[PDB]
Amino acid sequence: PAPLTLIGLGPMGQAMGNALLDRGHGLTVWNRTASRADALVERGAVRAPDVAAAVAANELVVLSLTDYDAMYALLGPAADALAGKVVVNLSSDTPEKTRAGARWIAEHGGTLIAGGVTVPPSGIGSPESSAFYSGPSAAFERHRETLRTLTRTDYRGEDPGLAALMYQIGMVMFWNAMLGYWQAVALADANGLKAADILPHASDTVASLPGFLRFYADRIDTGHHGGDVDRLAMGTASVEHILHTMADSGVDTALPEAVVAFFRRGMAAGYAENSFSSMVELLKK
Amino acid sequence: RPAPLTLIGLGPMGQAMGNALLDRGHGLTVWNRTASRADALVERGAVRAPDVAAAVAANELVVLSLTDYDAMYALLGPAADALAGKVVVNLSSDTPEKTRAGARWIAEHGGTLIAGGVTVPPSGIGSPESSAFYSGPSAAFERHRETLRTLTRTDYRGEDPGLAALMYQIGMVMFWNAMLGYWQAVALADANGLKAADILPHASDTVASLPGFLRFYADRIDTGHHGGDVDRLAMGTASVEHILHTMADSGVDTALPEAVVAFFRRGMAAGYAENSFSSMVELLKK
C-alpha cells in the first residue's frame, strides 16, 4: 500500500488514519493539536515536524478539515512545498469554494481532487462506505487504490465542484430528516415518551421515504405538480397542526414556524390545489 | 358480518375509506357538505343520508374525515341532538388539545369520541401494510375495532383522546422535514443542470441510512449521551452553513436553510460545539 500524509484528526480523520494504518499504509500525520495524533503515532504513524515537512513527506496529501478556508490557513505557509503534490480534500464546502481551492492548489503546482465522504466515521473502511470524487481524472486514477482503502469511489467527473455539489445535496436531506426526528423526540419527551417509544413509528416513517422519493422524482421531472394524491392546502393545515402541537407541549417552535412559513408561501403563490411538490418551483432559480 | 356505519367527509381520504368499506360489504351511509362527492359511492350502493342529522341517526358508528375539529363542530352542529349514545371516530388531523376539546364536546352531547390518526395517504386505505393510531374510551373502540380494521390495522394507544393525535403528528413532523430536505436537493440539482432522477440514487441511499441513525441516536438521547465521539456540532454548523451558501450560490430560495443554520447557531451559542448535534434536542425540549 502507498504512503501518504493526512492532515485533520477529528472523528472522521482519526477513522481515516486508523483505516489507512490497518491496510498497511505508511502514514505521516500533522495536527495543530499534537495530542490528537498521539494514538495514531503509537499505532505506527510518523508525526511530522511541521506542516511543510508533512506536505513534503508524500506525493499524496489527504485533508480532513472544517472547510476549504482551513486548507488556506494550514497550507499557505507551506505553499511552495505543494509543487508536484496531489491534495485530496475531503472537507465539506460549497462547490464554488471547492473550485477556487482547486485553482489555488494549481497555483502552487499541486493538483486537488475534491471528495465528499457519504458515511459517518464508523463507515470509513466498510463496504457500505462511499465518497464522491471529482477533479482531474488522471490524478484520481493514480491514487484511487489508496482512496478505496477509505471508501468505495464514485468519480463524478472533471469539475472539482461536482463532488461538493453531490455531497451537499445528500447532506441537506440528512440534516432535515434528523431535525424532523429531533422535533419528534422533543414532542414525545414533552408528553412522557422516550425516543425508544416513538422509534417504531419513526423508523416506519423513514422507511417509507424511498417510495415517496421515486414517486415525486418522475412527477417533478415531468412538471406534474397536480393535486391528485395530495393538496398543498392539506399540507399547510398539517404543518400548522404540528406547529401548534409542539407549542402546546412546550417544545421550541422556531423550526416548525419556518416550515409553516414556507407552505403559506406556496399558498400565496396559488398552489392550494396542487401537490406540495409545487413548492420546488418556489425554491428554483 | 360487517357492521353498518356512517361516513361524513367525502374528500380523497373519505372516498378511499367509503370504497374500502363498500368492497367488504359494510352498510354505508354517506353525507358531505357537497352532495356530488357521494355520487360514485351512492352508485356503488352507499345510502346518501338527506342531512347530517339522519346520517348521525343511521348508525352507532359515525366516521369523520374532515380538515380539522373546527370542521366537526360546524357540520355536526345541526346533528348535535342525535349524537346521544353514538361512537364518533374522528380521523381528522389536529392538535392533541383540540382533539381533547372535541372529545369533551361529543361527551356533552351524550356521545363518545374516539380519536384516529391515519398514518397513510388515501392510496394506503384497505392495505394490511397500513395502520392508524386510535385513542379514547377502550370499551367504545373495542366495540367498533372490527369495522376500523377494514380501513387500516388498528394501533390502540390508550384512553387519552389526544394520544392518537400526538403519535400522528410525531410521524408527520418527520415526513414533512425529510421531504422538504428532498425538495431543496431537487432545486439545487435543477439549478446545476441535474434532474430529480439524477440525484434519486443518492437521495434514496441517504434516506435508507435513516433507520440506523434513528436507533443509534434513540439510545443516546434517552441515556443523555450527547458526547461528540462520532460527530461535533461545530462540524454540523459548518455543514448547514455550506448547504445554505451552496443554495444561495445556485440561486435557490434559502429561507429553509436559513432556519436550519439559525438553529445550529443556537447550539453553538449554548456551548455545544464539542457535543453531538443531538444536544440541540435539549434546546428544543420543554
Mark whether B4 and B121 lie in a shared domain. Answer: yes
**Per the structure block, which three cell numbers stand in for A151?**
471508501
Burial state string for A139-175 with b = 16 or more CB within 10 A and e = fewer than 16: bbebbeebbebbbebbbbeebbbbbbbbbbbbbbbbb
Same domain, A53 and A75: yes
Residues 6+ apart with CB under 8 A from A232: A263, A266, A267, A271, A272, A273, A274, A275, A276, A278, A279
Residue B195 and residue B89 share a domain:
no
Experimental determination technique: X-ray
Domain endpoint, select from A113, A141, A157:
A157
CB-CB contact of B11 with B65 (8 Å): yes
Alpha helix ranges (H) inside B94-195: 96-108, 138-149, 161-191
Q: Which residue has the cell 472523528?
A: A11
Distances (CA, A) of A277 to A188, A211, A232, A284, B207: 28, 15, 8, 12, 18
Which residue is listed with cell 419556518? A258
In this complex, the residue of A97, A172, A205 whose CB is nearest that of residue B185 is A172
Chain B residues with CB under 8 Å of A271 CB are: none
Do residues A239 and A247 touch, judged by C-beta distance below 8 A? no
Same domain, A113 and A217: no
Through-space distance between the first and last CA atoms of chain B, rounded to whole angstroms: 48
Contact A87, A111 (CB under 8 A): yes
Q: Do A242 and B121 touch (CB under 8 A)?
A: no
Largest Cα separation within chain A, whole Å, is 66
Best residue of A128, A245, A248 to probe chain B, by most B CBs closer than 10 Å: A245
Q: Which one of A248, A283, A284, A285 makes the best mutation probe of the B interface by having the most chain B beta carbons within 10 Å?
A: A283
Q: The domain containing residue A35 runs over which residues?
A: 1-157
| Cα gap A7→B245, rounded to integer Å | 25
Q: Residue type at A197?
A: D
- Tell me which of A157, A182, A211 is where a domain ends: A157
The one-character DSSP state at B127 is -
Co-location of A187 and A257 in the same domain: yes
User: Rounded to a whole number, what is the distance in Å from the CA of A41 to chain B's nearest CA?
Assistant: 20
- Whether B179 and B279 map to the same domain: the answer is yes
Give the strand pairing for A60-63 and A46-47: unpaired
Residues A146 and A277 in one domain: no
Q: How many domains does chain A have?
A: 2
Extract the annotated binding site of B for NADPH: 10-11, 13, 32-34, 37, 66-67, 93, 168, 232, 235
Scanning chain A, the segments in alpha helix (DSSP H) are 11-23, 38-42, 51-57, 69-75, 95-107, 137-150, 160-190, 195-207, 209-222, 232-248, 254-268, 279-283
Give yes or no: residues A207 and A257 share one domain: yes
Q: Do A205 and B175 touch (CB under 8 A)?
A: yes
Q: State the Cα–Cα distance between residues A162 and A12, nearest whole angstrom.
A: 21
Report helix angle B161-191 to B196-223, nearest 10: 140
User: Cβ contacts (< 8 Å) between B243 and chain A: which residues?
Assistant: 168, 171-172, 175
Q: Identify the CA nearest to A15 among candidates A72, A87, A68, A90.
A: A90
Last residue of a domain, which of B131, B158, B185? B158
In the 8-state DSSP scheme, what is residue B49?
-
The amino acid occupying position B39 is D
Same domain, A76 and A181: no
A28, A151: one domain? yes
Asked whether residue A164 falls in the same domain as residue A277, the answer is yes
- Specify whether A143 is located in the same domain as A75: yes
Residue B118 main-chain phi, psi, to 5 deg: -75, 115
